Write a protein that binds this ligand. Structure first.
Ligand SMILES: C[C@]12CC[C@@H]3c4ccc(O)cc4CC[C@H]3[C@@H]1CCC2=O
Ligand SMILES: C[C@]12CC[C@@H]3c4ccc(O)cc4CC[C@H]3[C@@H]1CCC2=O
Ligand SMILES: [Cl-]
Ligand SMILES: [Cl-]
Ligand SMILES: [Mg+2]
Ligand SMILES: [Mg+2]
Ligand SMILES: [Mg+2]
Ligand SMILES: [Mg+2]
Ligand SMILES: [Mg+2]
Ligand SMILES: [Mg+2]
Lengths: 127, 130
């Protein structure tokens, strides 16, 4: 069996959303493997490795005006993978909005995200 | 239809839990590709094809009482895919249970589910009342 137990996958993925809810970049980017991949959104060309993932997050979060929170428990397999539902709250045209997302993560043998997919699209907006 | 737009996804996946909830096995199994592949749970080998899928739904839904609902919105993409959060209420050896689940699905070029991964485990079970 290190590779997170279904249990631990729960605590980790939950820590990711808090980092994200605070905007700590640097901390987000360390939760990933050095060579990870992000598909955000799913359906698009991946990215790859921490340098590009720090940049993605710098462009997405860095300008503030983002909160996120789980909207139900993390789900977690026996192999290293979990899925979670969350909602991001931001600001469009100077007014609130939102975005409902599901991330799906696969942790390595060191408990670092290796992959991930972020399910969403424009239907998942609102006000 | 053909490959389903993000909007069409949302409707197929929400129907699918309506069918699960009502327990119309036969109409569910038909929401799949005739050779679809179910990983339920994700981590355990798959199954495959409409006869083993059926068999799985009969085993899981055939006694009535299982209630399923969506606990938030279907998330949907642009490449024929979606993911959704829900909860399954079921009584297990005298007990009242619930299992929080997320299903990830891909559809086909024909509005049929080609693959389903279900994410879950005992950390998602609660012995509680619906
Ligand atoms: C960048 C983003 C906020 C941060 C979201 C985010 C953050 C972390 C994550 O694992 C997934 C996602 C999915 C959508 C992202 C939003 C798209 C538009 C926006 O303002
Ligand atoms: C089979 C099952 C009921 C039906 C659930 C179900 C139904 C549809 C679906 O797309 C995913 C799942 C995941 C869990 C399934 C339960 C595990 C124990 C049980 O009795
Ligand atoms: Cl939930
Ligand atoms: Cl949700
Ligand atoms: Mg916070
Ligand atoms: Mg490595
Ligand atoms: Mg908050
Ligand atoms: Mg119903
Ligand atoms: Mg086919
Ligand atoms: Mg109901």
């Amino acid at each position: 069996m290190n590779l997170p137990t279904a249990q631990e996958v729960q605590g980790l993925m939950a820590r990711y959303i808090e980092l994200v809810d605070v905007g700590d970049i640097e901390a987000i980017v360390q939760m990933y493997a050095d060579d990870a991949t992000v598909e955000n959104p799913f359906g698009q060309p991946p990215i790859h490795g921490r340098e590009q993932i720090a940049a993605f997050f710098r462009q997405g979060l860095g300008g503030g005006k983002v909160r996120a929170c789980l909207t139900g428990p993390v789900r977690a397999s026996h192999n290293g993978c979990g899925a979670m539902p969350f909602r991001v709250e931001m600001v469009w045209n100077g007014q609130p909005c939102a975005l409902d997302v599901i991330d799906v993560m696969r942790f390595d043998e060191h408990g670092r995200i290796q992959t991930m997919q972020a399910y969403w699209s424009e239907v998942n907006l609102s006000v």
